[PDB]
């Protein structure tokens, strides 16, 4: 009936002065736009059909044409930025916001879906959706005593659309929009559906990626213990954004970092630092690096949790990106740590894997490692044990690597390597 229609036939049906012919033609366009292989989105746009679909959204008297036109427009808005712009330029944003209050659940859900796609395009469309007043009717759909009474797919779509209103930077979402969304987001973060949990975590990871004032808004809502619980989930789609949010929070103040430690996050790091997914090990090591960039009592918590042997592990063997983050974690630890904490790092066997990484063809990691060597020597200087460290570096072949770096192309590497040779190996 409405399967495999040409664009010409769809246009003829939509241009008829017959509501049923228009409905049949709109359903045919929806089915064309829903096909797996190459839907003709540009052909539908070029035929001038977006203004027709947008007017059909306002036909309260014909709920099937509202649903078919909403679905057709959701498929166009899900495309490229130019395709999402064509939907916005057709006036679809206020028309979809009016459909959020529809008595038909499948229509309201379609409007939620469409607005998530529009807001998801970037900062300008996200902020334009917010200015048209989408937040109040979106939140009203979730204002129920128990989230469990809502249809599963409907709740997942609402969570995903809210996560897109939290997404993107330059600029970050408006402060008052974030404050308005946050209580519902905290509630979704305690829901038991894995997809709702993943998208709630992604939303929180977006809101905590920026200035420390942005982190504060989130941390003040008391979400850190729930994020640490999700950090220990078995589902990789949940662990990934929960680790990103935790990693983002520890880029903040010493106080914000302390909330992550107090909630018991460090107890999860033996498994995260050995996780079979390289992106988990990488982002877990980045998180560790920002904790070792903290206070001496915070470095001590890393020590007490037995995480220094786990840092020796990732520095010894891991994908190069994780090893570079491990090098940062060590340089941060040696910069802020006490002599006792730095001595403990050497006793855990940091020197040999730190030296082996001086062979890497990455100028940034070389600078980071040479800075760590200098900090370890400064601690050894305070104990008069520089000779014991010099022999250790010589024995694992570290001396040959530092000597070779005296003829390096980079200025900072050349200067730091010549400095170590003259001060401790002459």
């Amino acid at each position: 009936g409405t399967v495999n229609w040409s664009v010409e036939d769809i246009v003829k049906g939509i241009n008829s002065n017959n509501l049923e012919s228009q409905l049949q033609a709109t359903q045919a366009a929806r089915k064309l736009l829903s096909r797996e292989k190459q839907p003709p989105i540009d052909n539908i746009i070029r035929a001038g059909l977006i203004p027709k679909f947008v007017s059909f959204l306002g036909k309260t008297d014909c709920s099937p044409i509202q649903f078919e036109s909403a679905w057709a427009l959701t498929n166009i808005a899900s495309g490229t930025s130019e395709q999402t712009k064509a939907v916005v330029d057709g006036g679809a944003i206020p028309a979809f916001i009016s459909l959020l209050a529809s008595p038909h659940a499948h229509i309201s859900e379609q409007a939620v879906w469409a607005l998530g796609n529009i807001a998801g395009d970037g900062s300008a469309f996200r902020d334009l959706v917010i200015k048209h007043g989408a937040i109040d009717p979106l939140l009203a759909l979730l204002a129920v005593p128990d989230l469990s009474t809502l249809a599963c797919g409907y709740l997942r779509n609402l969570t995903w659309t809210l996560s897109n209103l939290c997404r993107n930077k330059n600029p970050a979402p408006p402060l008052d929009a974030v404050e308005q969304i946050l209580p519902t987001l905290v509630r979704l973060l305690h829901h038991n559906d894995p997809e709702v949990l993943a998208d709630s975590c992604w939303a929180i990871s977006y809101l905590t990626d920026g200035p420390n004032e942005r982190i504060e808004m989130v941390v003040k809502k008391g979400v850190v213990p729930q994020l640490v619980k999700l950090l220990g989930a078995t589902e990789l789609p949940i662990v990934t954004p929960a680790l990103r949010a935790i990693g983002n929070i520890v880029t903040g103040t010493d106080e914000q970092t302390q909330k992550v430690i107090d909630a018991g996050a460090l107890a999860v790091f033996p498994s995260l630092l050995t996780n079979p997914k390289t992106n988990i090990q990488k982002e877990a090591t980045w998180t560790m690096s920002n904790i070792t960039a903290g206070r001496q009592d915070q470095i001590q918590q890393v020590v007490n949790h037995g995480l220094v042997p786990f840092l020796v592990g990732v520095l010894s063997k891991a994908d190069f990106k994780t090893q570079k983050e491990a090098a940062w974690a060590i340089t941060n630890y040696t910069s802020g740590g006490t002599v006792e904490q730095i001595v403990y790092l050497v006793h855990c066997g940091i020197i040999e894997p730190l030296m082996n990484l001086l062979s890497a063809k990455d100028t940034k990691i070389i600078q980071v490692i040479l800075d760590a060597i200098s900090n370890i020597f400064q601690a050894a200087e305070k104990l008069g044990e520089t000779e014991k460290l010099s022999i250790m570096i010589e024995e694992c072949g570290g001396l040959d690597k530092i000597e070779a770096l005296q003829r390096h192309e980079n200025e900072s590497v050349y200067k730091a390597s010549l400095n170590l040779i003259e001060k401790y190996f002459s």
Binding site: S34, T74, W160
Partner: peptide, 6 residues
């Protein structure tokens, strides 16, 4: 992210 309704 964007998502099509298939």
């Amino acid at each position: 992210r964007k998502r099509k309704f298939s």
